[PDB]
Amino acid sequence: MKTVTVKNLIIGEGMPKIIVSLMGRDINSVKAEALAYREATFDILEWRVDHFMDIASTQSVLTAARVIRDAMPDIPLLFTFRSAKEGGEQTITTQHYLTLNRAAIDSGLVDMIDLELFTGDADVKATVDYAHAHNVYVVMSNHDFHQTPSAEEMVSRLRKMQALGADIPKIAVMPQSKHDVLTLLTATLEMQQHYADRPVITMSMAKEGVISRLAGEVFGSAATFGAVKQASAPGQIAVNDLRSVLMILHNA
Amino acid sequence: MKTVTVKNLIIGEGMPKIIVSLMGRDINSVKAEALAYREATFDILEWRVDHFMDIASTQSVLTAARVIRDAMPDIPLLFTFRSAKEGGEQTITTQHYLTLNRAAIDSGLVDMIDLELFTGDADVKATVDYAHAHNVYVVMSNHDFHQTPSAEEMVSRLRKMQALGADIPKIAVMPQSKHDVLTLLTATLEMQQHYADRPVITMSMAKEGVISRLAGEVFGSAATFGAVKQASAPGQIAVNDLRSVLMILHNA
Ligand SMILES: *[C@H]1C=C(C(=O)[O-])C[C@@H](O)[C@@H]1O
Numbered sequence A, B: 001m002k003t004v005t006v007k008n009l010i011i012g013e014g015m016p017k018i019i020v021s022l023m024g025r026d027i028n029s030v031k032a033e034a035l036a037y038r039e040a041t042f043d044i045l046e047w048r049v050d051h052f053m054d055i056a057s058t059q060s061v062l063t064a065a066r067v068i069r070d071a072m073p074d075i076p077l078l079f080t081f082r083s084a085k086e087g088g089e090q091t092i093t094t095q096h097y098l099t100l101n102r103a104a105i106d107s108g109l110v111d112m113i114d115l116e117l118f119t120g121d122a123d124v125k126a127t128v129d130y131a132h133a134h135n136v137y138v139v140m141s142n143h144d145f146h147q148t149p150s151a152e153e154m155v156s157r158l159r160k161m162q163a164l165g166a167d168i169p170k171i172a173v174m175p176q177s178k179h180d181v182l183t184l185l186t187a188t189l190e191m192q193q194h195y196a197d198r199p200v201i202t203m204s205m206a207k208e209g210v211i212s213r214l215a216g217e218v219f220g221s222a223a224t225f226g227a228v229k230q231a232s233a234p235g236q237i238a239v240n241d242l243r244s245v246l247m248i249l250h251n252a
């Protein structure tokens, strides 16, 4: 399988990489959070733009990005606007969404952008080519906050993400039973063993799916999310505890 | 489901209980190991009698048990002679095996005894009635050090163990692939959700199955084994790391 080297970090090799989400309401909050996160240990920083209230102005969004970039100029930065249909904080037009993403790619402020699969094939394809031309990596995603589809269906989505040029497919699902957690781990393993030719990120959310956030090295998930102060999705545990379990499982 | 309360410990409720194995070649070794183990934190102590080289004498075996009992009079004590066909250190006659077990039960020195399922139905049934009449609990076991049978076959064995009166069925299997580890977790969940009416202990051995020793609370295994100095079976990790992962997963 291929790996993705962002800055000095190699994704898809070794212990799963830890990603934390920064969530600020405005530039002052973003600024305060970026300075607080400097005292935490993680590998990739994801800025959840949907939590930013001034998304209406491209200049405000780019300015908040520059503030983050200045506080942690070494940390790979993932630019993520999570739409409300997929568990995010806000709803915006596809065109505004694409504009924010192309502008982030253009500015040279971010290392990766998150592009939702169901945005539309033609638009995602176009944005992917744009990201790559600017040397930016694409984490293509899909989230189901209500249930866990079959392993076969999840495997089909991850393969479609690869076909559309995603550098790192990502899928999050909501378990309704412990059985659903096993289905997610199974889909991850089949993906890693037979179809994946690049790093993949998967997770089962909520308390029941917590194990999927820890067993990444065993079943095939190249990165996992932990919480610094507050969680960006249900199930995330503190980064320090997440880091401890990963090392224990890695040196076992 | 029913729980098993050994001393002050409730098995089948809460965080999975940690069991460590004491392995001494002779009375002096057993004595040295028992005093060393006092500085470790675990819930149940399992004495692996098959590692004891003076098993020919019932008096020696009972004397080694009294030494352990005196060093840790509060810790639930599991008496286990593991035959070589199931990964143990020695081979003995069924009659000698039953004699050691009945003598251990008689002495009032142990809280639980391990009885292998494939010893013979009539003998296990008789030894089970004997253990119970003396208020001793039976951990009925089966181990496959070469492969992982189907989930349905594993579920069959665990149910047979319950039918023969086992207080705590236990099954250990060897994974040949990561898929085998998933089969073990699946069998554990099916068992806990549909058939189990008492605590069950399961595990997938080796490095690949390590996750099954950590995810007990999620899938249904009431106890897990950790190593103090040396492992009594492949895959066991240090008790302190095992204890850390269990608490993290428990408070998640
Ligand atoms: C994708 C999924 C998340 C999770 O399940 O941990 C975190 C979000 O911030 C991501 O964008």
Ligand SMILES: *[C@H]1C=C(C(=O)[O-])C[C@@H](O)[C@@H]1O
Binding pocket: B021, B046, B048, B080, B082, B114, B172, B203, B205, B225, B232, B233, B234, B236
């Ligand atoms: C049963 C199984 C073991 C394991 O797999 O950890 C430990 C042995 O000591 C037991 O008797």
